[PDB]
Enzyme design. Structure first.
Site, PDB file in Angstrom:
ATOM      1  N   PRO B  22      33.888  -8.037  67.425  1.00 39.02           N
ATOM      2  CG  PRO B  22      31.841  -7.002  67.067  1.00 39.02           C
ATOM      3  CD  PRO B  22      32.511  -8.335  66.969  1.00 39.02           C
ATOM      4  CB  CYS B  24      35.140   0.096  70.376  1.00 38.36           C
ATOM      5  SG  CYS B  24      33.678   0.309  69.365  1.00 38.36           S
ATOM      6  CB  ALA B  56      31.123  -0.805  66.682  1.00 34.96           C
ATOM      7  CD  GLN B  98      29.396  -4.639  65.857  1.00 32.66           C
ATOM      8  OE1 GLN B  98      30.104  -3.808  66.436  1.00 32.66           O
ATOM      9  NE2 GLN B  98      28.692  -5.569  66.509  1.00 32.66           N
ATOM     10  CE1 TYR B 182      26.497   1.924  71.966  1.00 30.84           C
ATOM     11  CE2 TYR B 182      26.729  -0.411  71.498  1.00 30.84           C
ATOM     12  CZ  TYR B 182      27.131   0.715  72.184  1.00 30.84           C
ATOM     13  OH  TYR B 182      28.193   0.642  73.074  1.00 30.84           O
ATOM     14  NE  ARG B 230      27.915  -9.417  69.858  1.00 34.56           N
ATOM     15  CZ  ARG B 230      29.092  -9.321  70.466  1.00 34.56           C
ATOM     16  NH1 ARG B 230      29.873  -8.262  70.300  1.00 34.56           N
ATOM     17  NH2 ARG B 230      29.492 -10.309  71.265  1.00 34.56           N
ATOM     18  N   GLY B 324      36.990 -12.400  73.107  1.00 35.35           N
ATOM     19  CA  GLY B 324      37.354 -11.001  72.985  1.00 35.35           C
ATOM     20  C   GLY B 324      38.507 -10.594  73.877  1.00 35.35           C
ATOM     21  NE  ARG B 325      35.992  -9.251  78.696  1.00 34.94           N
ATOM     22  CZ  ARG B 325      35.143  -9.472  79.687  1.00 34.94           C
ATOM     23  NH1 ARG B 325      35.142  -8.716  80.775  1.00 34.94           N
ATOM     24  NH2 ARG B 325      34.274 -10.476  79.585  1.00 34.94           N
TER      25      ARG B 325
END
Ligand SMILES: Cc1cc2nc3c(=O)[nH]c(=O)nc-3n(C[C@H](O)[C@H](O)[C@H](O)COP(=O)(O)O)c2cc1C
Ligand SMILES: Cc1cc2nc3c(=O)[nH]c(=O)nc-3n(C[C@H](O)[C@H](O)[C@H](O)COP(=O)(O)O)c2cc1C
Ligand SMILES: CCOC(=O)/C(=N\O)C(=O)CC
Ligand SMILES: CCOC(=O)/C(=N\O)C(=O)CC
Ligand SMILES: CCOC(=O)/C(=N\O)C(=O)CC
Ligand SMILES: [Cl-]
Ligand SMILES: [Cl-]
Lengths: 360, 360
Positions: B22, B24, B56, B98, B182, B230, B324-325
């Site tokens: 995930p 954002c 997310a 997610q 979170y 996660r 990811g990146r």
């Protein structure tokens, strides 16, 4: 970096010198583009290229290459391009489109489905048209029907209508497809044009279809938006010096006719050729066309590394570097080139939701 | 190549071991995703990754991180995801999501717009909630409101409703966001949880919100689709051995509660840490969780080169490698990885309109 300097032509400004050249996707149905194209074009535009020329789009159904080719032969076909135009502009790129007619290379299978002429037994095929009833040969053996004078008038009007629709759909850049052995190229080449009327024989006559089509499109295409064409300037058929000289003279007449930029390519009119494929091999030919016809140019066919693209601009061979297959591999290729050439804040070639994190 | 072996979990089969975790995008408005997300997710799915976990997505408005975060707190929000789900599936990837609640890290600016808590003068901010009225600190100084038992019941039901909505939108994989400081992570950590009721103090009590949310979601999420989470298993706060032991015990209880796979991460519960960032640095920690809890795992944070991803799988550290990146840089990263690892017919990691040309 010269590759990342802006470029202005008429009222259009490109944010860099990277152009995505037209690349057929063979994913349309009945000429209508769809979700394949929407994501394909939007993603590449977000990758940072300053200009995105949409794939060869047929001015008439029989002018498609394959049953998967895009078309713009009705207003409904044109309206399907509106969200593509919008997405390219929203990404900060300039939307262009190549309008086309496949001529004797039409009615063929998709490249991963045989790449050859559709057999006469197959209901997907159609009759092809061309200046003269002569086949390409090799994998394209179907003999086209030689066009009538009425056919020539009709196809010219189809190009006009296609340009009108492209204009109203919001494209800011148009490219007439006069290259790669399709209809326009085949009118110019003595290999394929055996006509004995006003459209064959002499240089003036072989040039006539292309100049009249350019003139007719010029009437409906806005003065403040670039009017361009792709044109094969040699064939590598053993007649290169004579062919290049005639092609450059035609480019001078295009310029007199209001052409703003020429995409310089190879003719591909016949299969019996010996093309010397290699990195940036078109560089010197594009440079000669640019200098001798005094016309801005782009070219392709092996400029898809950052150093080759940069070198071609610094050598004044090109005004824009067209990078095709590297953008199929990586739709953010412009960002890759920015990093490779050490551009400052290279990650901001991309929109913020990517750029923020890749700067780190 | 281990990276390109398929993976089956419950009724879901992924075509390789590359997962997009995930990420954002901060491009939604009032929780609704739009054409930013549609193109972003469709392009990466076409790039070849076997699993794409959507960013997310907040179970309640105050559970967003920023005004740009996606949400799924109403049926209209869920319907917005349907074209994303269907585009990921059309590309041959598996769509996951997610679902999240940002807890005390909520009501913040976008990362390229300050990345900090929204000022009390700003019309975009909202009241945040958490296990205890204690601020993260640093760039997130706002003190959250301590949740009541009624709030705990409501947030749990919001996760249940979000899971039901994700199911009906067509997602085939769900991830509960219990990581990264979170709401869920903050219930587990003694740094942020000073409650004196059934939801704080002991290990059982600190685990209770996470286990109860998992069990509530499990009642509505289909048994035949992977149920994952996660979770940050250590903080790099000088308490790593005790924290990882507790975290691994919670993973055992997740497994007993029907969890199919754990995405192993760092807690990020407080700013006072010393995270040893490095290539694949989570590898050994994920390996320990996988072996000691006897549960499939994925991890991230520096596996984004093809050889590192391959090595992690061959060493049995991970079952899926989250990259990811590198997918923000290159949406076709999975194809890049297939080429680097010498996969047979690597270009056919991509759909035919790309694969055919990159083969040759
Ligand atoms: C998939 C694909 C589709 C193409 N479609 C077109 C087209 O529609 N019109 C055109 O003039 N050239 C087309 N060509 C040629 C490209 O525009 C370009 O000249 C070629 O890819 C060489 O540049 P490159 O080495 O950067 O790929 C196509 C090439 C490819 C690979
Ligand atoms: C732009 C961005 C957005 C992210 N959003 C989320 C998210 O929504 N949920 C989550 O659990 N992690 C999120 N993270 C963490 C990533 O999932 C991943 O763990 C991180 O990028 C490390 O992997 P990488 O080295 O391959 O990039 C995000 C990371 C980035 C860069
Ligand atoms: C060396 C071959 O040249 C030819 O015969 C020719 N045009 O001249 C054709 O290919 C017809 C399609
Ligand atoms: C032989 C060169 O032809 C091309 O590059 C091409 N597709 O491959 C087009 O021009 C489609 C209109
Ligand atoms: C620093 C750890 O936090 C993250 O990775 C992240 N965004 O950066 C999320 O989890 C968004 C929900
Ligand atoms: Cl868009
Ligand atoms: Cl694959």
């Amino acid at each position: 970096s010269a590759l990342f300097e802006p470029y202005t032509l008429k009222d259009v400004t490109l944010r860099n010198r990277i152009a995505i050249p037209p690349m057929c996707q063979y994913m349309a149905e009945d000429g209508l583009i769809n979700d394949w194209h929407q994501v394909h074009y939007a993603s590449m535009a977000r990758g940072g290229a300053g200009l995105l020329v949409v794939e060869a789009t047929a001015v008439a159904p029989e002018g498609r290459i394959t049953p998967g080719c895009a078309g713009i032969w009705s207003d409904a076909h044109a309206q399907a391009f509106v969200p593509v135009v919008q997405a390219i502009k929203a990404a900060g790129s300039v939307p262009g489109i190549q309008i086309a007619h496949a001529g004797r290379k039409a009615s063929a299978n998709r490249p991963w489905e045989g790449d050859d002429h559709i057999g006469a037994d197959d209901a997907r095929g159609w009759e092809t048209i061309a200046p003269s009833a002569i086949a390409f040969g090799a994998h394209l053996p179907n003999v086209p029907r030689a066009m009538t004078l009425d056919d020539i008038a009709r196809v010219k009007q189809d190009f006009v209508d296609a340009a009108r629709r492209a204009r109203d759909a919001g494209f800011e850049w148009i490219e007439l497809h006069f290259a790669h052995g399709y209809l326009g190229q085949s009118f110019f080449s003595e290999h394929s044009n055996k006509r004995t009327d006003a459209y064959g024989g002499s240089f003036d006559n072989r040039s006539r279809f292309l100049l009249e089509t350019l003139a007719a499109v010029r009437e409906v295409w806005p003065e403040n938006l670039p009017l361009t064409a792709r044109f094969g300037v040699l064939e590598y058929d053993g007649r290169d010096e004579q062919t290049l000289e005639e092609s450059i003279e035609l480019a001078r007449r295009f310029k007199a006719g209001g052409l703003d930029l020429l995409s310089v390519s190879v003719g591909f009119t016949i299969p019996e050729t010996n093309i010397p494929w290699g990195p940036a091999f078109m560089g010197p030919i594009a440079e000669r066309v640019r200098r001798e016809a005094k016309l801005p140019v782009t070219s392709a066919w092996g400029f898809g590394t950052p150093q080759l693209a940069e070198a071609a601009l610094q050598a004044n061979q090109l005004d824009l570097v067209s990078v095709g297959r590297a953008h199929l591999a990586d739709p953010h290729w412009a960002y890759f080139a920015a990093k490779e050439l050490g551009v400052e804040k290279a990650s901001w070639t991309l929109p913020a939701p990517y750029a923020h994190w890749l700067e780190r």
